[PDB]
Ligand binder design. Structure first.
Ligand SMILES: *[C@@H]1O[C@H](CO)[C@@H](O)[C@H](O)[C@H]1NC(C)=O
Ligand SMILES: *[C@@H]1O[C@H](CO)[C@@H](O)[C@H](O)[C@H]1NC(C)=O
Ligand SMILES: *[C@@H]1O[C@H](CO)[C@@H](O)[C@H](O)[C@H]1NC(C)=O
Ligand SMILES: *[C@@H]1O[C@H](CO)[C@@H](O)[C@H](O)[C@H]1NC(C)=O
Ligand SMILES: *[C@@H]1O[C@H](CO)[C@@H](O)[C@H](O)[C@H]1NC(C)=O
Ligand SMILES: *[C@@H]1O[C@H](CO)[C@@H](O)[C@H](O)[C@H]1NC(C)=O
Ligand SMILES: *[C@@H]1O[C@H](CO)[C@@H](O)[C@H](O)[C@H]1NC(C)=O
Ligand SMILES: *[C@@H]1O[C@H](CO)[C@@H](O)[C@H](O)[C@H]1NC(C)=O
Ligand SMILES: *[C@@H]1O[C@H](CO)[C@@H](O)[C@H](O)[C@H]1NC(C)=O
Ligand SMILES: *[C@@H]1O[C@H](CO)[C@@H](O)[C@H](O)[C@H]1NC(C)=O
Ligand SMILES: *[C@@H]1O[C@H](CO)[C@@H](O)[C@H](O)[C@H]1NC(C)=O
Ligand SMILES: *[C@@H]1O[C@H](CO)[C@@H](O)[C@H](O)[C@H]1NC(C)=O
Ligand SMILES: *[C@@H]1O[C@H](CO)[C@@H](O)[C@H](O)[C@H]1NC(C)=O
Ligand SMILES: *[C@@H]1O[C@H](CO)[C@@H](O)[C@H](O)[C@H]1NC(C)=O
Ligand SMILES: *[C@@H]1O[C@H](CO)[C@@H](O)[C@H](O)[C@H]1NC(C)=O
Ligand SMILES: *[C@@H]1O[C@H](CO)[C@@H](O)[C@H](O)[C@H]1NC(C)=O
Ligand SMILES: *[C@@H]1O[C@H](CO)[C@@H](O)[C@H](O)[C@H]1NC(C)=O
Ligand SMILES: *[C@@H]1O[C@H](CO)[C@@H](O)[C@H](O)[C@H]1NC(C)=O
Ligand SMILES: *[C@@H]1O[C@H](CO)[C@@H](O)[C@H](O)[C@H]1NC(C)=O
Ligand SMILES: *[C@@H]1O[C@H](CO)[C@@H](O)[C@H](O)[C@H]1NC(C)=O
Ligand SMILES: *[C@@H]1O[C@H](CO)[C@@H](O)[C@H](O)[C@H]1NC(C)=O
Lengths: 937, 196, 49, 49, 49
């Protein structure tokens, strides 16, 4: 919108707090504008908080509005570039008054060079791309900017006064330098970039994005009267009777406490505001704005010396101001407000009314809340200017009349995102009924983004909704059984689930049209069970405070905290110790010395160790740690597992140690705790020849096909290998068990980053060194600075200890599940239906995992049913005591066919019934008479 | 065709991936197959009456059960599941469990709301009012009296949410091993399904 | 607020982490509820089911 | 391997010189959560645990 | 146990202007206060010996 405004080189001026290297960060402060009009396109005047200039291929004056003899301003000076570069002063051509700084700071004029200053809430920064200069000044406030320009610039010279705050996101490269940025108020997509600190955010649903609302402040509610004025200001209270005056519910003026004197008040005046009559006070603001608590008001009138009175000593929460010099003698009036807990606030300008139907946040009788406010019509009690039904705040009176408050419904949108141009806004609250959107309560609340479909989720805008069709790939599920798809234009669909098909066949009698499956398929159901975490040995004496001794004689006052923490970490550590020991006591099994060879099962090149196997090494390669850190160094040392060195990190009091048998160092089926790949399927009585005869005997056992030849086993073999070589082609998403190990890794990494940010950050204390706090502050105010961060490192450490404890309690009962899963599904063959896997169970291997164990349950879900007829058995004669027959290890079957046949219990390969597959018994139940004699001897 | 996912001052509650108490059990998309438990994985069985007669043959009460034994078990069934209406909260032992879950959840959110209503000894709950009234440094010790208290209320909620998630992780291992072994199959285990 | 030991990033990452544990684990619950009832839908006689 | 405190941040490690001269702000930097590079008196000093 | 080192400032440090003129009172005659930011003070050159 302008001729020459450099946007690429704003990033030379942004700075985070402390050297954050290679990830993003949001930082709030006074920062220059997006607007192409606010830069010039040459004396400039404007109001704001700070300013910023650059120069392409400057005598800047900053002052308050009302200037007196003793104020503070600045002006920066330039003449002709490199010849006379820059002088900076803080004074009033006339060096008449207080001059704080005389600093050159000579800059380099280049093709690109941006700098500026800020003074937002008196945090006066004077920034330059090498260095900043920070100040805070108590009696300072700057509101006026007098920019001036040189006579001629080659391109357009440029200047910007900044009006309000900004909260910009910042990326930063390997050297800590900023190189990309995005203001949060420029658009909509960068609003949620500023929400979750990521710059090019991937598609997905992003929950709980807020809407900033303006505020309203109601310290008093009832309509407010006046007060008696300043007292008589008579002689002293001992020689003659004198009275102080009270102030409870007055609309004060704070300038009728004096005689007008025609502008002759030097001390009460602010450099912008007028007459705060409290020129020095203890424990509270000199600046009086808004409403202050009630006070009784002493007054004195005494003599002085040459225009220079001395403030008296005063109670620690009373407040002093004086006036009335400039009458050709050295007498004056002084006063003391004391602010003693009257509860009736005293202030000018009683509050008018909240405009109804707007969702602005409030504060009424020292209770902030955030809703929309309507009038009401039921007049509750004459106490209680705001009431509560249960826990909610539902009815407030404001200025005599009752105002009912309902919750703001539009404050949270969950944006679901594809790219910049296409997204959809979902409000999880706020239904949109057509009688409600057109309501009179809602005239001032609505936006263009509220004309959406009222869903069961909420209101979704700028997206389609149709639940009649389903989808199965719930990549980013949304809730309530709904899923958002991100293929084309964004939409909301109803997610579904693949069906189950129980393997409990029912016992057959009284012949019926039983359907049997015609063929199965293998299904691998990988199942991660978290089973280890690194055992810890914390030392709270040297975590909560370092080598400083002044902590350690003060730390044992805090309720026996340190002995409880170290005894608890030892106690939970020895629970984990004994319980991982009981886990490996039921892993270490008794495989034979025969070690039966396989023929077509590639099980030795996937599941057996090479010193870890080719599945869990490939599994560790699929896991992405969030960033470099202490857990990143721990995990990436434990990932590649380079021999004959350690990675047990110690940092400032917390020694991590590996547990009694760490899972992700040892291979599963190798080493000392060998897990016996054979001893599951080959049974406790070994001697069975190969995996091929083992699998044929298995398929006979679970009743798919008896006496299975090479064709059925090799078909199951090609199924096995082509479905466990598919352990490489699954990513983190759409996996459901790589999401579990990534959830364990992210939980563990976020825990240690909490545990390190607790020791880095001062918790509002002046530093993190206890000596520096001790050698700087008071005898007692250093105590309240000590117990601000020793009580914060206490909370960070105890938060870690309770996270460690609850995950130990989870792992105790999970190891009961893991033990009952290994030596009942991996080592035996379970009769239980869904315990091993889905349906008919074949084989179940287990491998190691990060912080856990993961099972490979191979199963046989059937897919193609064929409906047949099924008797228990066949008779030829109606007589009790006839020759009757039943099937041997199978079911009798007819495919709507004239005669009966034999088929296994769980699969349909029909055979003519012979002497081999038929047991002759009895007339027990009502078997089916086929009314013809047998064809079998 | 409307929602109730409350949002109040920073905390948006959302329904989970499939909320149990919106969807019916044996209807809808996640249909739970009332038949497929007792009628077995190989269906085609005629009625519930022949299913129950085949069941009583299986667990060995009476073989080849006629209409009298199944109808006696039928009148037993209906007169004992129409007694799902005449049990109150006390003397129930499973309405006490859902009432314990509801009371735990309600007391948790009333803690989570009383943490944002109450000043923790600070002069107000508005940070501007604390800032525009008190000292440069005594307002810091009034700020860090309630920001350090809303911190504790929020973290107390987060650790309650975490421990109930850890409970629900292993409870869902029990619930899965109970549905597809006692509801869908017929368990050989003694006390896992029920008494006897 | 960001002086207090990384409190806020820990809380929102933890609620997201426990939320996605509950997300995947209710998903595995309904993956073993959703079953394969037949299209015959066998009638009852005296069971008011 | 003496413990330090540089710009109001105490830590405890061993300190070596380094040779890569990061930005002119930021007298100590952080890679992720670790405190890895400090400048002390103009020249960059790398700190290992 | 390791010994400690304390670095409140890092960059090399300049001097400051000394104690002011100590002239008459700030109302009858012009008087100025003096700032102190990055000075190697002596704390005994604020007086006459
Ligand atoms: C800057 O602000 C003005 C008024 O707020 C607006 O009209 C103008 O378009 C903005 N400039 C931009 C967005 O570049
Ligand atoms: C401020 O300066 C003017 C200019 O000489 C003078 O007349 C006035 O008395 C001064 N004000 C005070 C309070 O000294
Ligand atoms: C600032 O310093 C320069 C050089 O030291 C000097 O010429 C000038 O008078 C000084 N100005 C003030 C106001 O001290
Ligand atoms: C920052 O990230 C880039 C990209 O991998 C890398 O080359 C660089 O080394 C990183 N910086 C540091 C200090 O590790
Ligand atoms: C509040 O009191 C003032 C002073 O008497 C009066 O002018 C004003 O109208 C009153 N407000 C209402 C709503 O009556
Ligand atoms: C305070 O008193 C002055 C004296 O004239 C008057 O002009 C001003 O309006 C008063 N302010 C209020 C709020 O009444
Ligand atoms: C007031 O002024 C007189 C005359 O200039 C002087 O003698 C006296 O010391 C001054 N008082 C103070 C307290 O400086
Ligand atoms: C989306 O916008 C951002 C910022 O404007 C930009 O960095 C990114 O390249 C854009 N992406 C697409 C696909 O338009
Ligand atoms: C709605 O979607 C259209 C098309 O993608 C887009 O141009 C428009 O900006 C969107 N509006 C809102 C409010 O999301
Ligand atoms: C919402 O959009 C429809 C279709 O354009 C329109 O008929 C209706 O008036 C809109 N509602 C509002 C409140 O603007
Ligand atoms: C879903 O199907 C019903 C019944 O056919 C229909 O009334 C409804 O309009 C459909 N939904 C959408 C979004 O079209
Ligand atoms: C989608 O679902 C199908 C059927 O369950 C599955 O085969 C496939 O891997 C899924 N794909 C993705 C991307 O999740
Ligand atoms: C077996 O007996 C039962 C009950 O008497 C009957 O319902 C069933 O139809 C009989 N079986 C055959 C094949 O007729
Ligand atoms: C059933 O499974 C087998 C084995 O994978 C497969 O060959 C067949 O195509 C499947 N049937 C259908 C209808 O997909
Ligand atoms: C199994 O191993 C053999 C050995 O060479 C190999 O040829 C085959 O491709 C492997 N994979 C299968 C059968 O999926
Ligand atoms: C057997 O007969 C049933 C009768 O309902 C029919 O549905 C089915 O398709 C038939 N199946 C075969 C394999 O003949
Ligand atoms: C089974 O017996 C029938 C006659 O009962 C005969 O036709 C058929 O060839 C036999 N073999 C089969 C189906 O493999
Ligand atoms: C032949 O079978 C029918 C029904 O299957 C039944 O009457 C009896 O078992 C047999 N009848 C005769 C006359 O043999
Ligand atoms: C079961 O349903 C029938 C249908 O009318 C009803 O008559 C009977 O009372 C119900 N209850 C029982 C059998 O307990
Ligand atoms: C720091 O400054 C002083 C004073 O100029 C100088 O003597 C000293 O050598 C400087 N240090 C370095 C490392 O240059
Ligand atoms: C401070 O001044 C005295 C005056 O002689 C001098 O002896 C001493 O060395 C000075 N101290 C420093 C640190 O310069």
């Amino acid at each position: 919108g302008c001729e020459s405004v450099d946007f690429n080189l704003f990033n030379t001026i942004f700075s985070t707090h402390r050297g954050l290297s290679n990830t993003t960060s949001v930082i709030t402060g006074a920062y220059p504008s997006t607007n192409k009009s606010d830069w010039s396109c040459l004396s400039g005047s404007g109001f704001g908080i700070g300013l910023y200039v650059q120069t392409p291929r400057y005598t800047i004056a900053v002052s308050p509005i009302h200037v007196t003899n003793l104020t503070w301003e600045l002006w920066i000076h330039r003449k002709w570039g490199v010849n006379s570069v820059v002088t900076v002063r803080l004074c009033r051509p006339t060096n008449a008054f207080e001059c704080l700084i005389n600093g050159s700071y000579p800059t380099h004029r280049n093709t690109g060079y941006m700098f500026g200053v800020t003074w937002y809430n008196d945090l006066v920064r004077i920034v330059f791309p090498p260095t900043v200069l920070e100040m805070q000044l108590d009696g300072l406030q700057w509101e006026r900017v007098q920019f001036n320009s040189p006579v001629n610039a080659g391109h357009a010279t440029r200047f910007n006064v900044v009006k309000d705050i900004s909260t910009v996101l910042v990326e930063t490269n390997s050297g800590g330098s900023v190189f990309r940025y995005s203001y949060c108020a420029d658009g909509f997509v960068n609003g949620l970039q500023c929400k979750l600190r990521l710059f090019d955010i991937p598609p997905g649903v992003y929950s709980n994005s807020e809407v900033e609302y303006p505020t309203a402040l109601y310290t008093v509610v009832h309509n407010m009267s006046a007060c008696p004025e300043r007292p008589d200001s008579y002689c002293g209270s001992n020689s003659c009777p004198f009275k102080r005056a009270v102030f409870s519910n007055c609309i004060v003026n704070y300038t009728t406490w004096v005689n007008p004197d025609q502008r002759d008040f030097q001390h009460l005046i602010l450099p912008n505001g007028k007459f705060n009559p409290f020129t020095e006070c203890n424990g509270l603001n000199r600046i009086v704005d808004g409403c202050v608590p009630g006070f009784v008001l002493r007054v004195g009138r005494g003599k002085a010396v040459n225009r220079t009175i001395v403030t008296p000593y005063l109670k620690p929460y009373e407040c002093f101001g004086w006036s009335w010099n400039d009458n050709q003698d050295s007498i004056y009036d002084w006063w003391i407000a004391d602010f003693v807990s009257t509860g009736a606030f005293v202030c000018e300008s009683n509050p008018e009314a909240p405009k109804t139907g707007v969702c602005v946040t409030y504060t009424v009788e020292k209770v902030t809340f955030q809703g929309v406010l309507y009038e009401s019509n039921f007049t509750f009690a004459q106490y209680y200017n705001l009431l509560y039904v249960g826990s909610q705040l539902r009815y407030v009176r404001i200025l005599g009349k009752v105002y009912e408050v309902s919750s703001c419904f539009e404050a949270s949108y969950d944006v679901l995102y594809r790219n910049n141009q296409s997204f959809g806004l979902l409000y999880r609250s706020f239904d949109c009924n057509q009688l409600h959107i057109k309501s009179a309560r809602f005239v001032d609340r609505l936006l263009p983004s509220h004309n959406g479909t009222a869903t069961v989720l909420g209101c979704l805008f700028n997206a389609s909704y149709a639940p009649n069709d389903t989808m199965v790939n719930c990549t980013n599920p949304l809730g309530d059984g709904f899923c958002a798809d991100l293929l084309g234009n964004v939409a909301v669909r109803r997610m579904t689930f693949e069906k189950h098909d129980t393997t409990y066949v029912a016992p057959v009698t009284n012949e019926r049209y039983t359907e049997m499956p015609l063929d199965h398929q293998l299904i691998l159901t990988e199942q991660f069970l978290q089973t280890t975490m690194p055992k810890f040995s914390v030392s709270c004496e040297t975590y909560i405070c370092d080598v400083s001794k002044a902590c350690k004689n003060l730390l044992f006052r805090y309720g026996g905290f340190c002995q409880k923490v170290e005894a608890d970490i030892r106690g939970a550590g020895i629970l984990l110790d004994g319980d991982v020991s009981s886990l490996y006591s039921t892993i270490a099994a008794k495989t034979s010395s025969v070690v039966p060879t396989t023929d077509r099962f590639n099980v030795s090149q996937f599941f057996l160790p090479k010193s870890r196997s080719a599945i869990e090494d490939l599994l560790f390669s699929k896991i992405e740690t969030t960033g470099p850190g202490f857990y990143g160094d721990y995990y990436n040392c434990k990932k590649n597992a380079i021999q004959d060195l350690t990675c047990a990190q110690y940092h400032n009091g917390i020694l991590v140690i590996p547990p009694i048998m760490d899972a992700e160092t040892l291979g599963m089926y190798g080493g000392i705790a060998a897990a016996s790949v054979t001893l599951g399927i080959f049974g406790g009585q070994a001697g069975m020849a190969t995996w091929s005869v083992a699998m044929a005997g298995r398929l006979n056992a679970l009743g798919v096909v008896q006496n299975a030849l090479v064709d059925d086993v090799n078909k199951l073999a090609n199924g096995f290998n082509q479905l466990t070589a598919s352990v490489s082609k699954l990513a983190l998403t759409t996996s459901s068990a790589l999401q579990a190990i990534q959830a364990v890794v992210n939980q563990n990494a976020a825990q240690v980053e909490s545990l390190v940010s607790g020791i880095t950050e001062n918790f509002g204390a002046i530093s993190t060194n206890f000596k520096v706090i001790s050698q700087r502050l008071d005898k007692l105010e250093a105590d309240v600075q000590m117990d601000r961060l020793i009580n914060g490192r206490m909370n960070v450490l105890q938060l870690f200890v309770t996270n460690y404890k609850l995950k130990i309690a989870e792992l105790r009962n999970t190891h009961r599940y893991v033990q009952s899963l290994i030596n009942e599904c991996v080592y035996a063959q379970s009769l239980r239906n869904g315990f091993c896997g889905q349906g008919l169970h074949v084989l179940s291997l287990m491998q190691n995992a990060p912080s856990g164990i993961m099972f490979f349950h191979y199963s046989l879900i059937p897919n193609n049913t064929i409906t047949v007829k099924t008797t228990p058995g066949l008779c030829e004669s109606d007589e009790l005591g006839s020759k009757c027959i039943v099937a041997k290890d199978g079911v009798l079957v007819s495919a709507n066919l004239s005669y009966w046949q034999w088929s296994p219990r769980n699969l349909y390969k029909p055979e003519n019934l012979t002497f081999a597959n038929v047991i002759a018994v009895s007339r027990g139940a009502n078997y089916t008479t086929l009314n013809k004699t047998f064809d079998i001897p």
